[PDB]
Amino acid sequence: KGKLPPYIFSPIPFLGHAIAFGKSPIEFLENAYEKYGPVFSFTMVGKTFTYLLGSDAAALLFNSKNEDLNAEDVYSRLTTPVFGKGVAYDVPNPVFLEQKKMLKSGLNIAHFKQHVSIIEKETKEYFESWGESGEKNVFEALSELIILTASHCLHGKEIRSQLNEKVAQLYADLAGGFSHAAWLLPGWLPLPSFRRRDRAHREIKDIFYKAIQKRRQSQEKIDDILQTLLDATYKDGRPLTDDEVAGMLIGLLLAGQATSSTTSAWMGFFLARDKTLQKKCYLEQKTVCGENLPPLTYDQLKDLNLLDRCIKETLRLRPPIMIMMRMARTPQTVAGYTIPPGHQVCVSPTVNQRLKDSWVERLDFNPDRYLQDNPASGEKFAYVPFGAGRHRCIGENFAYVQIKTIWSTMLRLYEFDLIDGYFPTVNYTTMIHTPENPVIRYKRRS
């Protein structure tokens, strides 16, 4: 009822902080935290935004019911142009919850066991074109490759065979629609995400009419994923339209690719920058898999603990998801403040995960930080790259399978280096932080 969180003055009448935030969001929220503490509001584009920084505040959002802090109210703008109607934030949460469970069917030890071989092969195949040595763009490569690995692993061999590396460029433009601008403005501007949704939709639509050409009198007794969707029905019983199916396959692919490819690229540069550490990851491959480095198996992954912490530290310093957003529909209180209905409520993993008074040597890439007590273990919500509560990621496990496998394979192929000391800066083009000038030097390993 009572007290609003501290408000941050802007001299710009309706825009508010839209420009400064859009240009440098992290810097902004860090500065805001030092001056206003962990809970504050500011205006952007005639709207009020309340951020919850650090673990104790962020808990309000993470522990929230969707009825009170609503996701789709914010997210539908961003994702409905990308996935299309009928799926995700374009439907009630009870429906989206049903879809979420369909997609979880593919995600268990059974499938992961097969995934590891697919991924290792796709990777090795892909990086032939790099030959023995050079200087190349590793982010473009992983973007291409992970289209292939993700579609193969999650979507099946059939779908995979109709996709190729040109589809990465569709997906860059899909992900291009996850921008400050798209977040805050009505969709009438130079977003070509719509063209790429037209294409990615068509591409995925051929595939239904392919299984459906057989679906008539050919009932598949080969286990697939598109099959699961076509075969499945909602709680109430109704079957998914060809449109629902299609959207969910676009989303599943983006899910497997967008967050993984930026993360994978960053790890590259962190390891290229710290050579001692890259060495040990290589040695770990041998210690764990044997000096003769045979093909990778799912069961080897759980023991690649250093690489595991390298992924963890990358997601700490460069999470692919910088902020999560909800719309307050009912008043809410945190830290002695009341957030009224209408506030957009936000948390930032990026910020939480380098908080000046939580994370010692906050900006250092040190994966050994997890071998002593640290906020990821000793706080509930200081480390949240995959989120928490009712909205959290179903795909963390697959994600780690893909990135470990790709980077296990890649360390076996090459030794990586920076080019004249240059460590990529952050590119805030989109709300998925990619690295600047992501060209890595590489030569043959061993």
Ligand X SMILES: CC(C)=CCC[C@@H](C)[C@H]1CC[C@@]2(C=O)C3=C(CC[C@]12C)[C@@]1(C)CC[C@H](O)C(C)(C)[C@@H]1CC3
**Contact between residue 41 and residue 48 where contact means Cβ atoms under 8 Å apart:** yes
Written as six digits, the tokens of 105 are 């069917």
* 254 contacts ligand X (rule: CB under 6 A): yes
Residue 393, annotated as binding a ligand = yes
Written as six digits, the tokens of 121 are 């092969």
Tell me whether residue 89 or residue 282 sits nearer to ligand X (CB atom). Answer: 89
Pick one of ligand HEM, ligand X, none as the site partner of residue 38 (Cβ within 5 to 8 A by kind): none
Contacting residue, 204, 324, 345, 403, with ligand X by CB under 6 A: 324
Contacting residue, 179, 193, 263, 300, with ligand HEM by CB under 6 A: 263
| Run of H or E residues at 300 | helix 298-301
Pick one of ligand X, ligand HEM, none as the site partner of residue 381 (Cβ within 5 to 8 A by kind): none
Count residues contacting ligand X (CB under 6 A)? 19
Question: CA separation (Å) from 271 to 74, 157, 224, 326, 408?
Answer: 36, 32, 37, 35, 12
* 177 contacts ligand HEM (rule: CB under 6 A): no
| Run of H or E residues at 434 | strand 434-435
* 78 contacts ligand X (rule: CB under 6 A): yes
Tell me whether residue 269 or residue 386 sits nearer to ligand HEM (CB atom). Answer: 386
* 246 contacts ligand X (rule: CB under 6 A): no
Tell me whether residue 151 or residue 285 sits nearer to ligand HEM (CB atom). Answer: 151
Contacting residue, 57, 69, 88, 289, with ligand X by CB under 6 A: 88
Determine the Cα–Cα distance for residues 305 and 311; give it in Å rounded to an integer. Answer: 10
Determine the Cα–Cα distance for residues 265 and 269; give it in Å rounded to an integer. Answer: 7
Contacting residue, 385, 424, 435, 438, with ligand HEM by CB under 6 A: 385
Which segment (39-47, 50-58, 372-380, 394-402) binds ligand HEM by CB under 6 A? 394-402
SS3 per-residue string spanning 9-26? CCCCCCCECHHHHHHCHH
Determine the Cα–Cα distance for residues 43 and 211; give it in Å rounded to an integer. Answer: 50
Judge residue 306's burial from the number of C-beta atoms within 10 Å of its C-beta, 0-12 exposed, 13-18 middle, 19 or more buried. Answer: middle
Q: Are strands 47-52 and 344-347 parallel, antiparallel or unpaired?
A: parallel
Binding site for ligand X (CB under 6 A): 75, 78-79, 83, 87-88, 99, 178, 247-248, 251, 254-255, 259, 321, 323-324, 431-432
Binding site for ligand HEM (CB under 6 A): 71, 100, 255-256, 259-260, 263, 320-321, 324, 385-387, 391-395, 398-399
Known binding-site residues for heme equal 393
